[PDB]
Each structure stands twice: as C-alpha cells, then as structure tokens.
UniProtKB/Swiss-Prot annotation:
Effect of D138L: Some stabilization of an inactive (apo-) form. Decreased affinity for DNA, normal subunit association
Start and end residues of each HTH crp-type domain: 137-209
Induction line: Constitutively expressed, levels decrease in stationary phase; more strongly induced in an rnlA deletion mutant, levels remain high even in stationary phase (at protein level). Both positively and negatively autoregulated.
Site positions per UniProt: Activating region 2 (AR2): E96, K101
InterPro entries, sorted: cNMP-bd_CS, cNMP-bd_dom, cNMP-bd_dom_sf, Env_Response_Regulators, HTH_CRP, RmlC-like_jellyroll, Tscrpt_reg_HTH_Crp-type_CS, WH-like_DNA-bd_sf
Impact upon substituting L61F: Prevents SpfP from blocking galactose operon induction by CRP
Descriptive protein name: DNA-binding transcriptional dual regulator CRP
C-alpha cells in the first residue's frame, strides 16, 4: 500500500521516516505551532507560510514548494514554529516527522541536514521572497516584493506575458503590511499596465519585475 517517487538516496531514505500527508488547495497543514516538535517536508505541490503577532495581525511570511522543509525552525528555536502557519496553495504532499525521529536521521546520515538547512539558509536570504525583503517597507514597498516572489517560485508558471499566479489584492495584501484596501490601491497602477499586468486572481509579472 505504498509507492512514492524520489531523486536522491537521502531524500528517499528520510522520506520513509516521515508521514507524507496530502493537502489540497487552501488546506492548512500547520496551525501556528500545534506540533512544536515535528519537522515537515513538502514532497510535492506548494504552500504558504503565514505569521501572526500577539494580536493576530496575520502576514504571509513566504511561499514554499516541493522540496521545501517546514517547521525546521523549531529544530533550532524551540518547538517547530509556534508562529508560522502553513496554508497549502495547491494539492501538495508534505510529510511530517517528530524531531526525535528526524534528529536521529541527520545523525545517521550527514546529508538530510545539508539539503534541509540549505533551504532555510537561503529562505530568509533568498531576497524578494517576502522573507528577507519585508524589513524594507510595507505598502508602497512590500506589495512589489510579493508579486516578485511569486514570479521567482515554481508556483507562477511562465506565461507569454509574464507569470501565472493564483493571488491578488486579496492574498498579496496579506503578505504586505496592509490589506487589499491600501494594497489594492497600488495594484490599480500596475494592473493598468504601469508596472505589472495584475489581472486580479491571476497576476502576470514579466519575469519578476
């Protein structure tokens, strides 16, 4: 009752240690930090990492796709996230595994951490990914970085005009410091062929800006 794909000897050897869970579009995989001691790995599909303050501001930290680990932040913090919700953007297959199980793998075979750490080591530095560019400025500054991140991720297919994303003032704003209210205001400019062809649900970005 099994049979999954693979690419590397360590990616498959470890994949058998976790429980690959299939999550459809808009299917939250993590809730703040319900785990607080479990590592995740998007075996397929794509998801989004949301964050909330002590008031519940809610903000899309960044986007993740197949081959991306989640909750690993706790492996060097405390639990697993406890402040990084995970909302799947499309039919994905993220696997989960208790630290007590993962920590054993990284120690049994020095490679699982080299591939996982490499993701986080560039996840907050990737720049323009909405993770290491949010420090710049919210509305009138972040709204742009977002549209760019999607164009950098495999989620946004390469169109003959730009990219094929499944977001807009509705989701975009969430990634920024405001909502579609103030965010959409700036989108009205680009959407009008002044920076980016944002047709709403589908944002056509000319290869990241």
């Amino acid at each position: 009752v099994l049979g999954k794909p693979q690419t590397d000897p360590t990616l498959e050897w470890f994949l058998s240690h976790c429980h690959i869970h299939k999550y459809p579009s808009k299917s939250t995989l993590i809730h703040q930090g319900e785990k607080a001691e479990t590592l995740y790995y998007i075996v397929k599909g794509s998801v989004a990492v949301l964050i909330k303050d002590e008031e519940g501001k809610e903000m899309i930290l960044s986007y993740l796709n197949q081959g991306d680990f989640i909750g690993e932040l706790g492996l060097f913090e405390e639990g697993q996230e406890r402040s990084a919700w995970v909302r799947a953007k499309t039919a994905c297959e993220v696997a989960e595994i208790s630290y007590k199980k993962f920590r054993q793998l990284i120690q049994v075979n020095p490679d699982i951490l080299m591939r996982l750490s490499a993701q986080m080591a560039r996840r907050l530095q990737v720049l323009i990914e909405k993770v290491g560019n949010l420090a710049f400025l919210d509305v009138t500054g972040r709204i742009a970085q977002t549209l760019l991140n999607l164009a950098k991720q495999p989620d946004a297919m390469t169109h003959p005009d730009g990219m094929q994303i499944k977001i807009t003032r509705q989701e975009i704003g969430q990634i920024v410091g405001c909502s579609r209210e103030t965010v959409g205001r700036i989108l009205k400019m680009l959407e009008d062929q002044n920076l980016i062809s944002a047709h709403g649900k589908t944002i056509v970005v000319y290869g990241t800006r």
